[PDB]
Design a protein around this nucleic acid. Structure first.
Lengths: 82, 129, 22, 121, 207, 215, 81, 71, 99
RNA sequence: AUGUCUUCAUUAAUCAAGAACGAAAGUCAGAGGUUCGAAGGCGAUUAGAUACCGCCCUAGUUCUGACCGUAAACGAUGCCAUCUCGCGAUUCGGAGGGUGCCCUGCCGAGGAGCAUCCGGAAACGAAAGUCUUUCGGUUCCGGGGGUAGUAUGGUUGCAAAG
RNA sequence: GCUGCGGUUAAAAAGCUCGUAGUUGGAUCUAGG
C-alpha cells in the first residue's frame, strides 16, 4: 500500500523479518541458563553455541554444535536470560 | 561498493515518489543527506523526516508530499563560481521561476538563490524541482 | 559456410604469398 | 444445398415472434398463414420460410429458443424468478445449530458479537 | 459505517453472513486484500465487509438518477440477483456477455453513459472494467480474497464465488441503498408495498 | 446536429459554455460539434498528405494519409491523422480528428511576470517513437526557434517565444508532429509550485445539470 | 497561477488527486470522481444536496491502490471508523 | 560508461584524441599523405595539357557516352 | 530476430550439456535441445493380443511391455511429425498436447 | 550458501603493462590402437557428382609429457553498489510447529517461469527500467558499406597460424 | 558526445579470471537554547 507506517512497524512483521533488514538490527540469538538434571548448576550458554560447552566440575556435555542453534543434550532444560 | 550515499538516497526518494508512496526509507544517513533533506523541506518539496538511530550510519524515513518532480545529484562535485552560477542554473533547472540548485559553500549547504544573495561560490551537490 | 570459405581462401593466398616472399 | 440463408432465418424468426398464435405444427397451415401475413415475392422463398417456421415451432414446443421471445415462456420464467418461500432459509428462527470453525477466535468477538446459535466445531 | 450506532452491524445481519457462508474466501490471497482477512479457506473480516458495503451504498445513492447506475455480471448464479437489484433500485442491468463497445462506441444502439458501475466479479467482468477505464466511470465490485483490484474503486470483500452468498450480498446492497434512500427503514425492514423482500428471492435457484 | 452523448446534449443546451470545464472534469469528447460550438476561432492546416500502399494480389492499394493541425492561437491546439482512399475524405477526417483531439496548453513567463504569458511554463519534453522534442522557455521577442513542423503547432497553440531541441528521425512528419503535440500537452500536466494550492472539488456538469438530462 | 500585477491569467486550474496530489490531465480518462452522500446519524437518510467529493488519478487507479486510497480518505473524513 | 572522476581529465582527453583517428573527416584531414595522394596538391585549380579524348559509358540506368579528356 | 526466449533449449545455470545421437538420423543433438518421448507399448499389437492370449500356454499370463526413451533431433522430429510448427502465440504454450 | 552477541578494522571496486586457465581441430615425442572416421579408394545416383547414399579404410578419435591460444568461447547483453510488483512453484541452509513427508501469504542464498511500472525503432527487456527530468564508480570497444583483418613493419610459434 | 552519443539483433562487451600504474572510495568529532 502507498500509506505504510515505516517508523512503527508491525511487531509480527518485525519478528518475521531478517535480522539485518529490521528498522533497527537485533540478533535472533539469546543467552540461556541451562539446568541439567543432576548437579543442578545453572550454566550460561549461547543459543547458537559452536563449541561444546561443558559442566565446570560436573564435567558433562550440555550442548552439541549444529548448523543453527546448538542442540541441548537430553534431560537438560534452559531459560532465557533478560 | 557504495560510493555516494546522497545519490542512493535521492534515487530512492525519486522511485518512491514515482510509485506514489507516502513514506520512503533512506539507508545510510549522513550530515550531507540531512542538510539536503532540510533544504528540500524548507522549500516544501518533502514532508517531515525522522532520523532513525541504530548505533551506525543510521537510517532516515521521509514523508513525501507528492510535490517533487525530480531530485538528482551532480557527480563529481564540480566547483561553481558566481560568474557561471547563471549558466549552470540555466542548464540544469527546468525554469527560472522554480527549481533549486544545491551548493556546498563555506557558509554551509544552501540553494543557488541564497548563494547568489550572499555572493558565494562553492561545490555543486545536486538539484531538485 | 560462406565467409568461412573466404577465410580459407585468404589463408591459402597468404600461404602462397609467404612462400613467394621467402 | 439445404442450409437456410439468413434471409429465410430472419423472416422465420420475425414471423414466429409476431404471429406465434397463428403458427401451428403443420407445414400447410404455416404456408397458409404466411401467405396472408407476409408479402413474399417468390413461392419457393415462401415455402422455405414456412418449412423453417415449422422446424422452429418443433423446437419451441420442446423449450425456449434463443432469439425468440414467447409470451407464455417469459411469464413462466418470471414466475419462477418471483418464487419466494414462505419464510427465509436465513431467518434466525431457522438459524439454530450452525457449525463454525475456529474463525470465532476474535473475528466474531472483537466485532462485539456473542452469537448464541454459533457452535464451534 | 458513518460513525453511528444506528447504522452499525446488526446481530441478525452478521448472522445471515455465517448462514450463507459469505465469509469464506478462496485459499489464494492478494497483497491488496491483506486488509480484509482475519487469519485452507481464508476467513474475511465481517466488520470490514459491512463498512465497505455501506461505503458502496453511499456511493451508489450519490447518483440521484437511479438509471445511470449500471450493474454488470456474467456469472450464471448472479442473474436473479442482478435482475432483482435492478428492479428494486431502478438501475440498469447487463446479463451475460458484455458487448465490447457499450461505453466507448457512441454509435452503438447499446451505447450507455453510466455515472457509476457495479460488478459481480472483476475477473469475470474484466471487459466492463477495461471499458470503464476509458470513460472514467467509477467502479464498485464484489471481490474475493484473490481477486485483482486493478481499476476497482470500491471493492466490497465477500464470497462472490459462492452460490448463496452472492445473492445475499446483492440483497444487502439493495437494502442499504433503499434504507439510505428512505423507501424503507431499518426497523420496518426490507418491505415495499407491503411485500416482504426476502433474501431467498435473490438467492440462486437451479432450474 | 442531434447530440448522441450527455456532453453533447449539455453543450447544445448551452449548459456548458466553455472548454475549460470539460478539460477540468476530464470528460472525453466524441463529437466534433462540441468543439465547434465551444471554440469559434479554430483554424486548421494540412501539414502533409502522404500516400501509403498495401501490397495485394493485383498490385498496390494506395490510400492517402492526411495530418491536420488545428488551433486557436490562444492556448488550444489539436493534432489529427486520417488515412482514407481519397485525399478529400482523408482531409475531412483528419480535421475531425484534430477537432476531437484539441487540448489545452499552459503558457508561462521566462523572466519577469509582466504582461500576458508568452512562452511555455518550463522545459517540457515530448516523445513519439524516435522523435523527441524539447521546448525551452525564451524571452519576449525571441520568436519560435524551431523547425517548421513544430513551429506550426506552437503558433496554433499560441506560444510566441520558445527555443526548441529536436532529436531523432525528424524527417518523419507524423512522429515529429506527435512529439510536439505531446510536449505541448505536457504543460498542463507538469506540477509547478504555483499549483500546489489545494482547491475544492466542484460538482461535475452531469451532477449539476442533471435535471435536463433526466428530463 | 498568480502573475502580472496580481492578476490570474490561467485558462483553468487542474484538479489534483485526493490521495497522491498529482495533477489530473484533460485527457486522463482513467481518473474518477466519486461522491458519497452525507448521512445524519439517527434517521439514516441522505441529506439532499450534501455530498463529499473524492478524485483519484488514473495512475493510482491502474496501479490498483484506488481501493485503499478511497478507504483511507473515508477514514480520514470520518465516513468510516 | 565514461569515467566521471574529478581527476580524470588526462584519461578523457587522451581517449578523445585516440578516438578522433577513427573519424573519416579527421583522419582524411590529418593523415599526412593528403598532398601526395591528391592530384592538385591541396589547390582548387590546376593547369595541364591534353593527351587524348575518351567517351565513358554512363552508369545504369543512364545510357550515354560522356565526353571527357585525359590531361 | 530471436525466435525463443529459451533459445530453443532447456539450458539454464549450465555451460555445456552432453549430446545424444538421434534415434532416426544419428545426428548429435544436445540432450536438453533434443526432443524426448517415453513410449510404453504392449509387446503385441492390439490386433494380435487376442491371438497370443488364445495361443497362450498358461491359464493366466500377463503380457509384458516395451519401454523406449526416444530422442529425436529437431529436423527428424519435425519430418516424422512428432512436433509441428505453431503460431507465434501458440509457440509459448508449454503444456503437453492432449493424448 | 547458511548459522554466528567470534576476530581485524577500511584492509575496498574496476583495472594500461603484466600473468594463470582456456572446447574442438591442429603440431611434437612415447604408448595404444575397439569404435567411428578427414584425406584416399571403390559401388551407386546424375547431363556431370571430385557430393549427399552404401562399402573398405589412413591421419585422428584414447592415455602420458609438452606446444597453439583460437570458437555462434552466446545471455550475440563487462564488473561492483543501490531503488522500483504481483503470484505460485523449484535447489541448498536455517527458525517454529505436526506427524522421511506435511504445515508457517516464515528468513536468506541461488536457478527460473507467468503479473508487469516504465523503456525501446520494434522484436521485446523486472532489466535492455529508475536518461533532454541526461550527471553512483570503473574497464574495454564503435563512428556509412567495401578494399580488409588484406599489404607492410613489429612481435609469439616447430608449423599451422595468433 | 566534459556539458552530451552508442555497444542483445543496425558498427561496437575482451573467452574468463588474477594484477601493478591510473581512476573512484561507507558512517563518525559544538549541536543547541
Amino acid at each position: 500500500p502507498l500509506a505504510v507506517d515505516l517508523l512503527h512497524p508491525e511487531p509480527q512483521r518485525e519478528i518475521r523479518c531478517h535480522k539485518l533488514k529490521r528498522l533497527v538490527q537485533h540478533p535472533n540469538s539469546y543467552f540461556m541458563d541451562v539446568k541439567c538434571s543432576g548437579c543442578f548448576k545453572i550454566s550460561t550458554v549461547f543459543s547458537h553455541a559452536t563449541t561444546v560447552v561443558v559442566c565446570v566440575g560436573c564435567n558433562t556435555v550440555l550442548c552439541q554444535p549444529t548448523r543453527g542453534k546448538a542442540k541441548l543434550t537430553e534431560g537438560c532444560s534452559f531459560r532465557k536470560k533478560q | 561498493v557504495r560510493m555516494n550515499v546522497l545519490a542512493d538516497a535521492l534515487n530512492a526518494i525519486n522511485n518512491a515518489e514515482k510509485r506514489g508512496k507516502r513514506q520512503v526509507l533512506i539507508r545510510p544517513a549522513s550530515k550531507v543527506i540531512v542538510r539536503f533533506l532540510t533544504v528540500m523541506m524548507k522549500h516544501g518539496y518533502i514532508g517531515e523526516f525522522e532520523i532513525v538511530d541504530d548505533h551506525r550510519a543510521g537510517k532516515i524515513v521521509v514523508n513525501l508530499t507528492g510535490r517533487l518532480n525530480k531530485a538528482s545529484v551532480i557527480s563529481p562535485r564540480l566547483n561553481i563560481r558566481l560568474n557561471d552560477l547563471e549558466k549552470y542554473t540555466n542548464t540544469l533547472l527546468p525554469s527560472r521561476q522554480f527549481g533549486y540548485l544545491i551548493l556546498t559553500t563555506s557558509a554551509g549547504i544552501m540553494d543557488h538563490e541564497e548563494a547568489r544573495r550572499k555572493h558565494l561560490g562553492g561545490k555543486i551537490l545536486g538539484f531538485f524541482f | 559456410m560462406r565467409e568461412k570459405w573466404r577465410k580459407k581462401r585468404m589463408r591459402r593466398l597468404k600461404r602462397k604469398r609467404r612462400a613467394a616472399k621467402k | 444445398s439445404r442450409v437456410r440463408t439468413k434471409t429465410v432465418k430472419k423472416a422465420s424468426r420475425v414471423l414466429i415472434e409476431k404471429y406465434y398464435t397463428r403458427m401451428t405444427n403443420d407445414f400447410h397451415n404455416n404456408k397458409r398463414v404466411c401467405d396472408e401475413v407476409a408479402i413474399i415475392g417468390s413461392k419457393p422463398l415462401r415455402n422455405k420460410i414456412a418449412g423453417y417456421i415449422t422446424h422452429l415451432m418443433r423446437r419451441i414446443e420442446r423449450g425456449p429458443v434463443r432469439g425468440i421471445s414467447i409470451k407464455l415462456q417469459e411469464e413462466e420464467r418470471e414466475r419462477r424468478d418471483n418464487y419466494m418461500p414462505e419464510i427465509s432459509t436465513v431467518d434466525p428462527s431457522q438459524l439454530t445449530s450452525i457449525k463454525v470453525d475456529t474463525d470465532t477466535s476474535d473475528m466474531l468477538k472483537a466485532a462485539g458479537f456473542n452469537l448464541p446459535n454459533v457452535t464451534v466445531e | 459505517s458513518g460513525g453511528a450506532a444506528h447504522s452499525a452491524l446488526t446481530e441478525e445481519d452478521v448472522m445471515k453472513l455465517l448462514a450463507t457462508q459469505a465469509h469464506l474466501g478462496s485459499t489464494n490471497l492478494n497483497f491488496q486484500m491483506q486488509q480484509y482477512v482475519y487469519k485452507g479457506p481464508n476467513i474475511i473480516n465481517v466488520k470490514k465487509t459491512w463498512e465497505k458495503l455501506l461505503l458502496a451504498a453511499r456511493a451508489i445513492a450519490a447518483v440521484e438518477n437511479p438509471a445511470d447506475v449500471v450493474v454488470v455480471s456474467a456469472r450464471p448464479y448472479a442473474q436473479r440477483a442482478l435482475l432483482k437489484f435492478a428492479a428494486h433500485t431502478g438501475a440498469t442491468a447487463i446479463f451475460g456477455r458484455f458487448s465490447p463497445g457499450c461505453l466507448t462506441n457512441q454509435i452503438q444502439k447499446t451505447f450507455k453513459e453510466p455515472r457509476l458501475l457495479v460488478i459481480s466479479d472483476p475477473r469475470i467482468d474484466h471487459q466492463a472494467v477495461t471499458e470503464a477505464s476509458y470513460v472514467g466511470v467509477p467502479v464498485i465490485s464484489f471481490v474475493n480474497t484473490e481477486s485483482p483490484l486493478k481499476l476497482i474503486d470500491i471493492g466490497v470483500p465477500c464470497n462472490n464465488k459462492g452460490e448463496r452468498s452472492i445473492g445475499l450480498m446483492w440483497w444487502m446492497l439493495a437494502r442499504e441503498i433503499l434504507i439510505l434512500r428512505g423507501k424503507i427503514s431499518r426497523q420496518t425492514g426490507f418491505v415495499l408495498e407491503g411485500k416482504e423482500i426476502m433474501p431467498d428471492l435473490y438467492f440462486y435457484r437451479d432450474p | 446536429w442531434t447530440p448522441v452523448t450527455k456532453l453533447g446534449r449539455l453543450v447544445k443546451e448551452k449548459k456548458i459554455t466553455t472548454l475549460e470545464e470539460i478539460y477540468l472534469n476530464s470528460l472525453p469528447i466524441k463529437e466534433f460539434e462540441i468543439i465547434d460550438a465551444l471554440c469559434s476561432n479554430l483554424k486548421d492546416e494540412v501539414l502533409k498528405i502522404s500516400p501509403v500502399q498495401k501490397q495485394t494480389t493485383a498490385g498496390q492499394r494506395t490510400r492517402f494519409k492526411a495530418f491536420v493541425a488545428i488551433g486557436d492561437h490562444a492556448g488550444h491546439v489539436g493534432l489529427g491523422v486520417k488515412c482514407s482512399k481519397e485525399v478529400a475524405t482523408a482531409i475531412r477526417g483528419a480535421i475531425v480528428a484534430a477537432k476531437l483531439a484539441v487540448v489545452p496548453v499552459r503558457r508561462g513567463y521566462w523572466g519577469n511576470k509582466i504582461g500576458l504569458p508568452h512562452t511555455v511554463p518550463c522545459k517540457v519534453t515530448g516523445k513519439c517513437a524516435s522523435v523527441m522534442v524539447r521546448l525551452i522557455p525564451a524571452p519576449r521577442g525571441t520568436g519560435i526557434v524551431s523547425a517548421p513542423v513544430p513551429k506550426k503547432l506552437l503558433h496554433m497553440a499560441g506560444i510566441e517565444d520558445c527555443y526548441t531541441a529536436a532529436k531523432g528521425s525528424t524527417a518523419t512528419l507524423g512522429n515529429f508532429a506527435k512529439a510536439t503535440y505531446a510536449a505541448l500537452q505536457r504543460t498542463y500536466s507538469y506540477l509547478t509550485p504555483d499549483l500546489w494550492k489545494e482547491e475544492a472539488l466542484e460538482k461535475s456538469p452531469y451532477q449539476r445539470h442533471h435535471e435536463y438530462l433526466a428530463r | 497561477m498568480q502573475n502580472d500585477a496580481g492578476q490570474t491569467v490561467e485558462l483553468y486550474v487542474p484538479r489534483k488527486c485526493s490521495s497522491s496530489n498529482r495533477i489530473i490531465g484533460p485527457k486522463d480518462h482513467a481518473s474518477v470522481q466519486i461522491d458519497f452522500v452525507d448521512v445524519d446519524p439517527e434517521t439514516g437518510r441522505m441529506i439532499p444536496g450534501k455530498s463529499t467529493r473524492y478524485a483519484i488519478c488514473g495512475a493510482i487507479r491502474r496501479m490498483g491502490e484506488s481501493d485503499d486510497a478511497i478507504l483511507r480518505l473515508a477514514q480520514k473524513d470520518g465516513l468510516v471508523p | 560508461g565514461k569515467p566521471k572522476g574529478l581527476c580524470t581529465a588526462r584519461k578523457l582527453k587522451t581517449h578523445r584524441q585516440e578516438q578522433r583517428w577513427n573519424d573519416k573527416r579527421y583522419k582524411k584531414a590529418h593523415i599526412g599523405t593528403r598532398w601526395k595522394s591528391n592530384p592538385f596538391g591541396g589547390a582548387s585549380h590546376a593547369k595541364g595539357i591534353v593527351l587524348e579524348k575518351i567517351g565513358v559509358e554512363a552508369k545504369q540506368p543512364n545510357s550515354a557516352i560522356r565526353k571527357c579528356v585525359r590531361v | 530476430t530471436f525466435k525463443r526466449r529459451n533459445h530453443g533449449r532447456n539450458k539454464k545455470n549450465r555451460g555445456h550439456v552432453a549430446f545424444i545421437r538421434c534415434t532416426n538420423c544419428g545426428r548429435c543433438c544436445p540432450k536438453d535441445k533434443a526432443i524426448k518421448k517415453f513410449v510404453v507399448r504392449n509387446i503385441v499389437e492390439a490386433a494380435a493380443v487376442r491371438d497370443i492370449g488364445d495361443a497362450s500356454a498358461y491359464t493366466q499370463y500377463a503380457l509384458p511391455k516395451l519401454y523406449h526413451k526416444l530422442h529425436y533431433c529437431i529436423a527428424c522430429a519435425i519430418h516424422s511429425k512428432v512436433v509441428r510448427n505453431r503460431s507465434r502465440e501458440a509457440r509459448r504454450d508449454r503444456n503437453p498436447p492432449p493424448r
